Amino acid sequence: MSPWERILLEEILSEPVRLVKERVRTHTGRELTYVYRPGPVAASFVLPVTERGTALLVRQYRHPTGKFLLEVPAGKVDEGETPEAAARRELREEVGAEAETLIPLPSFHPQPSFTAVVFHPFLALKARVVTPPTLEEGELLESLELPLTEVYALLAKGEIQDASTALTLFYAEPHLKRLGLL
Template identity: 35%
Template sequence: MPFTGISKITMSENLKWKLLSSSYIHKGPWATLRTDKCEMPDGRIVDEYYVLEYPNWVNGVAFTNEGKVLMVRQYRHAAGIVSLEIPGGVIDGDEKPEDAMRRELLEETGYQFDKIELLSTVYANPSTANNKTFCYLATGGVKVQEQALDEHEEVVVEQYTIEEVKQLLADNKIAQALHCTGLFYALSKLNKL
């Protein structure tokens, strides 16, 4: 079928819903739930579409000066698992994503990094949540302090080679999807897939 002249961007714009109203069900420091009333492009009305509002996040594939990948292991209560992850966390207020990444790396691992490069910006679940995650590659890490964890954090820092990380991914030992995504982008950038 020949191309009709309508651009893909125009077609995508035609898929957007019009927001008619919003009301909040719950507002909390880590998650907020609202319901939106929307109009679809064909005029149908969606009376209650539930949206979770979260702060934006950062995560980083962090390499020490010795070329080891820093990973963190911690308990994740909602899933009831001890999870092996890359360092990361919530962006505070109007903090810039790169500054949040440097802060999170320092707090969780005690390492400071020469270079931090944005690899990708992804959404955890854009059908129900509005936040995004900025995935970084951090290199030249040097330990400069002990961890500075939040009150309810218990984080164990571990170091792995690239080959070990690839095996952990192959063996499904890294359960956090956004962290697998960050690792994919980092390994791709480094030509290590």
């Protein structure tokens, strides 16, 4: 029951990422070309909090913006892998950490006008560093540790530019307050 009918779907790119240019017939009967990143595709985001009420974050270079941004560990969910598994894997790869309970937070679309991707946020409890990070070629990031009070001060001051990280922090806040970590 889609409002738009597919006329032709052309693959514009397969990698680095898959992009399509779709010719469709809209709700007005007229034709339109839409370019987007098709789904189903997903990524997980995880706020790792330690028992001391600090968070394990990363400062990562995001080329399109030319800036290093403060973010929660994250990454694409692999084929056949669950969002939670990808969350635990990225936590280990990027911050060399493991955690106990992972509370799933509300999923969201970062930019539905251009990509089908769904981001799945999580709050990881009792996070602890157990190994060296495993960064891949193409990724430029460093892990850091900040008291949650400072992280949330930055959020309130509007200094958290990465939308997913900001949203993850907003959804995690009541849980952190409930658990006595904030």
